Amino acid sequence: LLLECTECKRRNYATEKNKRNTPNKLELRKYCPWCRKHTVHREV
Amino acid sequence: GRSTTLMRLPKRGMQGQVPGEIKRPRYQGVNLKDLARFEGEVTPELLVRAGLLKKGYRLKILGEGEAKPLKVVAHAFSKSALEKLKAAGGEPVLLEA
Amino acid sequence: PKMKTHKGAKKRVKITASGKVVAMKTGKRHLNWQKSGKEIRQKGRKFVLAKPEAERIKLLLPY
């Protein structure tokens, strides 16, 4: 299952790969956008 | 009969639209070095008949060259050449456009 | 009678000032999915070819 981490207070993205059924319903790991600097990211 | 090397890819986006080719002002670059060649009050008029502009229209003096003291009308100037040309003369910008 | 410039080339290769010929790195529009961040940054640049690079030029000339 493919995944792209959207940023909060924005709309950035990042290359990724969820895992769905295996314990993974909430993906919210950190990242770092070029716009601004350093922010938390959702799943989506 | 395999793939050419045409496996490469057109980054050259903005390549064409139906009516295509939007007419716009063509600026031609000309340095102070070939500008110092002569002297008086250089203008688009001189430069075309000089063999440097060739009706390419729109003139922008720029960069590499030793600023010969004199007046010089043009449609644009390089920040760099603008300062050199101020350090030994004066020059007005294009007409309307 | 009067060679036609190859548009496929013109549309995706630029011939440099010294003679070299450049174009974008391959594989970058959809191959990814999570491929290293290092990958896509280096796939972002453009490069020089060599022998086809000389084959390339022939396809232009008026250009």
Add this chain to the structure above:
Amino acid sequence: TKNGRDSQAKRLGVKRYEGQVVRAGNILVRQRGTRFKPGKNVGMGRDFTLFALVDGVVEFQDRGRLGRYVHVRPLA
């Protein structure tokens, strides 16, 4: 006849021998595991690739129970 098959042979081995001049970054050994270990001025990448950290000559060394090491004794 389920055979007749293989895989593109990776040209791996010692890429720079002892008593050779190397520039910083030069790959010294491409290896399967740690058939050679790093050492003075020689770091290795995620694949085990040993490479020079600075310019200089390359010198090998062995240490039995401790294994073999590649070095780069600089001087320039």
Add this chain to the structure above:
RNA sequence: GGGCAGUUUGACUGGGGCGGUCGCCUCCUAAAAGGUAACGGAGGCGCCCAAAGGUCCCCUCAGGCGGGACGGAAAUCCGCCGGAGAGCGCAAGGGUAGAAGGGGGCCUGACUGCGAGGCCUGCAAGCCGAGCAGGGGCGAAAGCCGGGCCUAGUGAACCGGUGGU
């Protein structure tokens, strides 16, 4: 809607067909650098993991023998022996306990912008990478972090979808 029309219906192959095979990784063939063929000998891959990742701290196997209530060849515990024959998600190989293996704390560098110098190489690709800047993680610190012990887990261009500038 073969009444009619234009076409397609692959290659390898001790002739062609039937059969089998077509890309990638491991080993042998391979003649002690690299590389090397055959419809030669053997196997695998088209995934998986938010912990199976980062860091800091700690621990060390398999097996054998002796002893223990359920247990019995084997569950759990004690003792002595045991240097790696275990483990390392999966094939083989190389590597490895002076950790890459097992357990825990905190964390998300499975970062952004780059990238000296090289391995491999017909092209295109593929691989390694110190270091600089930004903003961070773990550690007292020296430091380590641009996913996973590594080598498979993949697809030029073209055409279009989606989000942004």
Add this chain to the structure above:
RNA sequence: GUAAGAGGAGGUAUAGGGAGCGACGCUUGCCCGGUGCCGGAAGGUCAAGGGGAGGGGUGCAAGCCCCGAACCGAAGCCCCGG
């Protein structure tokens, strides 16, 4: 045959076209699930077209222009039989 028309036929189901079998004799069994053809005013699917909830572009504006849901739409296909 593009058509006008012509053949069928200046014939009319005891006639005409297509198909199979092939004097004559005794006969021609079972299977309709698939395929074909025949029947079926239901229903399901369906094109243009009708409709127009709602949405967008532009203009100060009256407007102009565009996108577009529900619902109503034939043969065919599905489905029910022979």
Add this chain to the structure above:
RNA sequence: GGCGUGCCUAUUGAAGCAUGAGCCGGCGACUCACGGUCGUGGGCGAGCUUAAGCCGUUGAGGCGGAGGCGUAGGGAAACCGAG
């Protein structure tokens, strides 16, 4: 007396029992146009050159700068510029 396996073609290999030719004469096959690329002989030179056409000739040349290439590159572009 010594020595001695036609010619061509095609081939790993031909005197070959592989191809072509009865013999002679004549006909018979890498061209031209335009556009490139390199070399070369010259003219000019940060410049070089005209095209159609016009005037002139009747195997005579000249005029014609519209235009083309070069003197600036980088960028998809807006733009900037020895960057």
Add this chain to the structure above:
RNA sequence: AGCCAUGGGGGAAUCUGGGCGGACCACCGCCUAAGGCUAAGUACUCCGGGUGACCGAUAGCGCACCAGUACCGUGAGGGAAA
């Protein structure tokens, strides 16, 4: 995907009218559809002339000559030599 043209359907206005400047709208401009005619510059070479770093009877037009003939073919057509 405008513009020009038009097979089918709906179907105006007469200058405060209409068409166009690449969907569409506003602004700014250009032009007057649904009637027709017009020389020159241009193309060709059956015919006449002139000229060739064009051929010289296997060349040159197929034909230097009583040749589109003889001869071949039902015919269209083929087609010499000299």
Add this chain to the structure above:
RNA sequence: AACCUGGGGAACUGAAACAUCUCAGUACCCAGAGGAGAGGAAAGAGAAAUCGACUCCCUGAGUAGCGGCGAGCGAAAGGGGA
């Protein structure tokens, strides 16, 4: 004879297969015009508040652009001339 306008209009071939595309509006069939034919007095061009019927040459230009963005196709304004 060829040249010209119009009504119809192929395929081999190229894409190293082939179907879009190409060859090509070419071959050819037909109708018509004349020493020429066609075109022709802007419901034009398209960015200059610019040009001012048409035709033909040079150029712009292998540009703009078209294109299984493959093979390949390929303008116009403007400028120099008749």
